[PDB]
Structures are given as C-alpha cells and as structure tokens.
Amino acid sequence: QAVVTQESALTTSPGETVTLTCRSNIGAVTSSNCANWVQEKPDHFFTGLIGDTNNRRSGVPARFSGSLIGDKAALTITGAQTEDEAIYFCALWYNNLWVFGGGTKLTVLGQPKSSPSVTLFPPSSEELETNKATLVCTITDFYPGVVTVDWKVDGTPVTQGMETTQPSKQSNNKYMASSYLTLTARAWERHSSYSCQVTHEGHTVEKSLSR
Amino acid sequence: PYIADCPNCGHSRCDSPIAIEEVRGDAHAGVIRIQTSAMFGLKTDGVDLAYMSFMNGKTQKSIKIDNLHVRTSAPCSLVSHHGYYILAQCPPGDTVTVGFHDGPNRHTCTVAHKVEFRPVGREKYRHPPEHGVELPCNRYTHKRADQGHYVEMHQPGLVADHSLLSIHSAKVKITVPSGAQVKYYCKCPDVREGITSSDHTTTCTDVKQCRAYLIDNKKWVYNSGRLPRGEGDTFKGKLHVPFVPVKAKCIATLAPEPLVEHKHRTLILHLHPDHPTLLTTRSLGSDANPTRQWIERPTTVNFTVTGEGLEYTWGNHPPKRVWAQ
C-alpha cells in the first residue's frame, strides 16, 4: 500500500559520477525506511550493496555509497565502471513489509565491441535416422548484444523453419544466441547448400555447410 | 550545547539550542547575564572562546560565532560569552530576544522578561553617560576565571530522535548514533528496554508508536527547567558560573548643578535636571522634617531652613550643607 519509484534507465560513461534515486509515494523517505539497494547482473545474479540507508554490504566497492537526498533515498556510484552496468533495485521498509522499486537499468560506457563467433553444425546422423535434420547455428561472444540471423538454403532465404533465441548475457558480459533450422530427413537430402548469416555491428559473417 | 523549547522562536514554540532561560536584568550597568541552552565558547575539543557550538541534530556544530545577536527593544551589545552563558549590554526592554545566524538560516530565540536599568544614584536615568561620579554599582564581570558560585550541571535525560526509527522494508528500524544507548519498545509487545546497537522491531510497524530515545550521557548539561530528567541518578557535574555579580564602580550618573538662591532662612532653588532626580534633605534639628521628591520637570522649590542647618542632595551629586542664621 506504498509505491517505490525509480528512474527507468540511466546511461553514463566509465569514470563518471551517477546518482540513482528511490521515491516513496507516501512521503519523504527517512532513516526508518532503511533504504536497501540491490544489484541484478545477468543470470539472475543478486547481491546487496547498501542497507539501512548507508551501510555498504561487505565486499562492495567503495565507489558505491547511499544517502538521503531531499525526500528520497539515493545511491551514488563515484567513478562508475563498465562492470557496474546492471539493474539496481531499491527497497523501502514500511513498519511491517518491504516494497521494492521497479529497478533502474544502468548502462556504463566500456567493453570494446566484440564480433560474434559463429558455428554451423550439420544434422547429426543419429538424427537423420529419425527422418529429421536440424542445422544449429551458434553465435557467442558478441557485443553489443544485438544480431540478425538469416538462413539461406540453396541460395534462397529460408523464411519458415527457423527459430532464433533471444540474446542471453554471458558471464564476461558479452552475449550469445543460437538459431535452429529444422528440415525433414528428406528436405535435408534435397537441397544442397545451407548457410547461417549473422549480422553484427555492421559486419556480416556467413557460415556455410556443404552436404 | 543543550537544546530546549524556545517559547516564541520566530514563529512560535520551536526547540532552539539557544533556548533562553534565566534572564537576569538585575544589575545596573546596562548589562544582562543570559543562559542559552547552547554552549558556545571553545569548540567541541580545545580552542578559541570566540567560536560557536550549538546542537544541530543530535550533534554539535562547533564553528564560528560570526553573527550573534542578543537584542531587546533595541539591539544589545555583547560583552562576553563563557560556557552556556553570555553577558551583553542591553537597554531596557519588556522582552529579551536572542539569536545568531548560522548562515543558511536566522535561527533565533526570544523570551519574555521585564528588564530595566536604573543606575545606582538618586538620578533615574535610562542609560549610562560618559561622565559623572563613580559609585558602587552592581554589575557582572567581563571574565571567566571565576568560581564565586557554581550551579548543578548533571546529565541530560534522553531526547527524542525519530530520524532513528527508519523502516526495515516492513518493520520499523531503529539505529544508533555511535553505539549510544537507545531506549526502545513500541505500543505493541517487542524489545522492552533497548540498550543496543541498531535494532529492528519484530512486532510494531508504525514509526509513530515507538520509543525513539537517546541516552547519550557522555556529556552533562545545564539543569534547565526545559530538560527531561535523567531518571537514573544525580550524576556529578558541579560547574561554575563565570559572570558573578561584582561590586564594580560603574561610570555613573550626575545631575546638573543647582541654582542656589538666598532668602530669609529659606532656600529658593530654581532647578533644572537632565533626568528624574530624587532630591531629599534633612533639617538637622531633632525634628528631622525630611523631604523626598523625584524631580524630572524643572522646578523652583523651597526649603524652610532652620537656625542650625539643613543639608541638600542634588542627586548622587554629593550632599551640600547650609548655615541659615
């Protein structure tokens, strides 16, 4: 019966100072709200940063500090780093329960771009023994995390049969994704040239197999 | 630097650190000794009387005195500060009105107190002159090296601080200044004493039903009427007063000389003072037949002098005497 509000997204560059805020719909935030700040890195990875407004969890870099600014709780990153790019959630206590904010997606300049590593595999034979054939195109270590995957059977853009996952964040903070093109044992044996084309930060990478 | 409840703190009753108690317009020299609940003087630690430590928060603020203002009907003149206590040369005033300027805010404190300044003497001035006779007034010192009296100054009681009682995302969350002693429970049943570091509150939720207290008796206080008792004990802390009332000879009053005029066993005296002057006489017969009258309006008066003599007292000007055979 209280609504915590946070900035939606904030973009900064390595070395800058950035402030995230946490607003309560009922009134000014005070020390009896024990503002907590939590960080979510990709992979459902949670860590606590600050608690009780300004107590930094142990092993959280000092570039992170909490405080009350005006009528709201604030988190300041002093010397933001590339590693700080994540979702920050604030939590406020209200005498009997906790209310979490919507979280702020923070983007920090860094991590020089990285091209994808693409590999296309042929349907294995145990699978061709099922009267099925699935060409797997794996794409890993790319950043920025956005790609376009296009399949081309025998020179012709396939347009049905393919499925491409959504970019998932790896540990190093780069992304990955795979695309599947399912044919039939038979569709397989028919056509002759398969190719998985991946477009990333303007360059294209085509990986073709030959049956 | 104690903090108490100022009565008409600009708007109305605030809690100013400079809350004025014990106004003493009881001397003569245009001076009042005052106690703020604030302890200006040296800093928190060791230096420079002319700095300024009041309470902001639970905390002191030991900084410069830059823009003190005591005032009354007119702006007063500071004389000296020591401890909780300031001496200042004021004119008469129905009230007393004190205040510094921290810099972001005026942050003053004001109070009622009947003030006057009669100088000692049969002249009822409103103000001390530059000249005139010296004679034994009552007055407070400039100095600090003073022990002539001491007032009890034992501990503070607790104080409220609801900045402590934050929320642990569903429960009301108390914290502590520096490990100070926070005395805690809520209307519901939970922790009942509170002698702790930062606790939570299992039972209650609302900040407005809990005991935000600060037993922080590392430094004693003045025993203001606007103090809550420290219930435990009469701790030590007997502490002097600087501004003792002393027997200074004020630079003091003098009324303009009379115009003596002879008549037959009679003094006509055309008379013309500066201020209301108590004249009086003593017909030196065993019949005294004295007279008293404050004279502020110029007046030709008369005195049936006898054979043996009369005496005559034009204010604190010395007593005259007269042969009227």
Next chain:
Amino acid sequence: PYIADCPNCGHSRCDSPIAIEEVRGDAHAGVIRIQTSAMFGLKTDGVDLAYMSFMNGKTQKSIKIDNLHVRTSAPCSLVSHHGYYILAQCPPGDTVTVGFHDGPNRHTCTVAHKVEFRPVGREKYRHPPEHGVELPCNRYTHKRADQGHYVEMHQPGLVADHSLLSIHSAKVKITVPSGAQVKYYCKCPDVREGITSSDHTTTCTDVKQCRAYLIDNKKWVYNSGRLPRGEGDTFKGKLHVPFVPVKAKCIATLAPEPLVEHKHRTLILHLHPDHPTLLTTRSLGSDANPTRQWIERPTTVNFTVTGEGLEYTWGNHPPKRVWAQ
C-alpha cells in the same frame, strides 16, 4: 506589483513599489497585516511564494526575497506574505517602516501609523509572554487558502514613463514597451489620442510638454488611493484577502497570584503584578458596588466584603469568590 508614492521614502516622498497602504495594527498578537503596492509571492509566472516581484521601471523584477525588513520602533518579525500583502509580528510603534534590499540599494518605504498591542485580558502587557492562559484573541492567519473577504482589484490607470519620449534628432520620439498602448499628444497640435507603436512627434520638440503614458492593462492592480484611475471602466478583478482576522486563542497573559489576607469582613490584599492589571469586583448584593482600577504599581488594597459574598478578578486569571460571614 503596483508602484505608488511612498511618503517618507528614506529621504522624502519617492515612488516605491513597496508603498505602504492599509496598515492594520488592529489585532492583538503582536501582528500587523500590511499591503505593499508590490506583489511578492510567486514569480511573474508560477513558482515559490518565497520569491520577490516588485516593479523596476515599467517592468517587474521577480527574484528572491533575500533581505526583507518590516520594522517599527524595533525590527519586526515577518509572519507570511501572499499577494500584495504581508503579515509580520511587530512591537508597538508610532510609525511603520518597511523595506527589502534588492542588493544594489536599500530601497525601503516608511509610513505613519499608530500601533499598539494590547493582549486580550485584563493585563495590559506590552508583549506576549511564553506562558499564561489562552483566551480568545483576534489575530491574522499564517495561511493563504483564504476567501473570507475579497477586495476590488481592477485595472491600473496609465503611468508616466518619460524614458519613452526620446528625440528623433529634432523631434520628440515616443516608443512602446511591447506594443502596449501609449496615450500621446503634446501641448502643441499633433497626434491627439495615441494608440500606437513607436510614434514620432511632428509638432512639438520638448520632452517636457508631451504625454508619456502607458495604458498597459494586461494585469490588474490593487485599488490604492495612490493609484490614478483607469478612466475607461471598472474592469473585473475581484480578488481575495489572505490574512483574514481569525479567532485564534493567543498564547496570552497572566498576572502573578495575589496574597490573600483575612480580616473581619474585609480582604486585605497585598498585591504585586508584572504589568498594569485591571482588577475589578462585584459585591453580589443587589447593591453591586463594583470597583475598577488598573494596577501596575504593587499595592495593598482593601475590599469591604459583605455577608453573602464578593468576587475577585486578578487580571485574566479566573474570577475568585469569597464567603465573608
């Protein structure tokens, strides 16, 4: 923010934007409601009551309030501003003397007005205390959300501005603020109304014989006596007053308790007040035989109490009663 003719504007009669009209030392609480001709409050547009818009030139100057000073015999205390109007806690004073500080100049305004502050009660203090009984005083509010009355505020008339009447290298040259309506002609025969952009003047030459006028009725004004009528019409602009007189219970007076002393059907009362206290009684017989006397000097008094009873009113301290059989 209207501009009018202040009467003793530092030197003499200037035209201050803070020209003081309608001084009201008619309440009890140390407070006066004042109208400046200046409209402080929000800015020209939309923000922050605590900013400051007076007229400089034909133009406003909507900036910070930094160093307001109302004052009288002593410096007053601001209470609140809204619109043209300020409430301020003042002591008594023969006059009223107002002024801010723009920063380059003092730029004050001053006025005559008989001021007093009787508190409500049979005690005739000079000032409100910190304690005593509460009882129904008359007083103005802190607030703005107020409609209890409204004063007419229709247009301004024109105003002079000879900064307009420049010279076109031989002819006197009028201009316009922003396309405002400039009402123009000279003693000679030339353009006779003036509802124009920047005109010239064919006929006359001297700036000192022409009509430098500003019909600029895009914003109404207070209907000051020191306003020239807008001759055209009673335009709209009925506008409230913030500071209504309300029935606040002032923190109020109390006189020190009496010393009751018995005699045979007679109350000796050694008595010793703080301030002039109106004492009075009612011998409860159908013979009333009341008494009234302001007492400021301590006085032992007497009251022939009857068999059935008397009552006794030590100031606004509650009425006593007495069996004297």
